[PDB]
């Protein structure tokens, strides 16, 4: 619901996604 | 539904997507 | 629905994308 | 609904788009 | 709807675009 | 030296700075 | 030295830095 | 030395850096 | 030297660092 | 050298670095 990220240096991605229904990557 | 993200040097991305339906990326 | 997002040094992207239909990226 | 957002040094994009139909990007 | 968003040194865009039809970037 | 840049849509920044000294971002 | 760059619909940054020295992002 | 980069719908960042020196990112 | 590099929806970064001294990421 | 590469839907990061020297990563 209220998620808390703290990054450094990201060179790639971050994906908290809370899924209800479908979806693809 | 609140997200709290706090970054630094981010080169990539941040995906903090709530879904109730469906998506592609 | 109220994103709190801080973020500093910015290469990339931030997707804070709630969906309740479809879309592609 | 009603997003807060803070940056600094932003080189590249943020999107905080809350779709209820389709769209590409 | 009502968006608060605080910004500096932008070099790059915000995209806070709230969305009911289709659109393309 | 001479750089050659063509863009189209371009949402973010693009950075071609050839460095000899000290900088930041 | 002379770099070709093509982009269409970019979000985030291009770095083509070419360098001799020390810098930090 | 000369480099050839095509793009589309970029979200994050390319590093294309040649280096000769020291560099952090 | 002359790099050729095709993307698309690239969510992270891309590194092609040539490198002859020494550098941290 | 001339190094190709093709992606699509890359969420992570790819390293195509020639190093001659030292680095971290």
């Known amino acids: 619901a209220?998620?808390?990220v703290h990054?450094?240096?990201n060179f790639?991605?971050?994906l908290?996604?809370?899924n209800v229904?479908?979806?693809t990557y």
Chains 1, 2, 3, 4, 5, 6, 7, 8, 9, 10 share one sequence.
Do not use: D, H, P, V
């Open 2 to 4: 209220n998620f808390l």
């Open 7 to 9: 990054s450094s240096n």
């Open 12 to 14: 790639g991605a971050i």
């Open 16 to 18: 908290s996604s809370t």
């Open 21 to 23: 229904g479908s979806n």
